[PDB]
Amino acid sequence: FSNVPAGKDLPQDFNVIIEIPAQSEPVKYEADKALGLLVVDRFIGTGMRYPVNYGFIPQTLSGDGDPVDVLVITPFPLLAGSVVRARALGMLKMTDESGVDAKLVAVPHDKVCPMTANLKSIDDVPAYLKDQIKHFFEQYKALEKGKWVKVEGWDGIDAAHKEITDGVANFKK
Template structure:
């Protein structure tokens, strides 16, 4: 598979593709897409033993402020396979900073045509508070045992900020 062949989406920023790197509730292994190889590679084992509460991936053909593609957390009723592509829409974004700088995470669900079970989720207000707490807790703690690494969660922002992150990511990639 070549990540370079996967478009960012059909109707950006409202309708975008996400390549899944880490399935929800999978073993605590951090995978990263290697754009040169076109494969997922093991970045590291998560020492805290924590599992990602939702699917973790990225929007292809984007570049965020940290030099990586735009990160996305995709809420689904079932875990998705690593390397799969899911058509998605944003609900909002978790703003964070880590040892490398700004590291925002879009919060998304599959497009309604892909998953009618999440069609009722229109914004972060519709996401159960407990799930938002799990996501926040995960990112506040998953690097806790890694020397020199840290994360500060700055808070939740809405769909407009998520759409701006996508649009800027596409523009940065095209530069």
């Protein structure tokens, strides 16, 4: 996660470290140090599973103190902790109760995943998947307090690439 380059040919050709695999259970665990065990923290959202793989681009800083943030679309889930060579489709833009959030949207390299090769951009994503992606985030916080999420929409590849370019630059200081 630390020694993983951002990409072989940036910003078109980037690496993503998987965090949460598609279809993952909506449950947050939390290592107790003082204990050496995983503790069940809480149950996330209204009970909907993660609809895509979620991860990050290593060696990036997105002005969120966080790394650049990626939703990776694949026909089968990817292992948490794995690294996938990827390419951008675009981005999901959201507003929060505490600001703005863009998630990058990606598919793997065509040689890795030949089945996603027909997905040239975000407009190529079936409407059902896109609708499951946005709905996930709209229900994610659900319930909690004075928390919420509004999906503002989708941006394109060029915006994706800018997020990536800037992320790689920030991270260098």
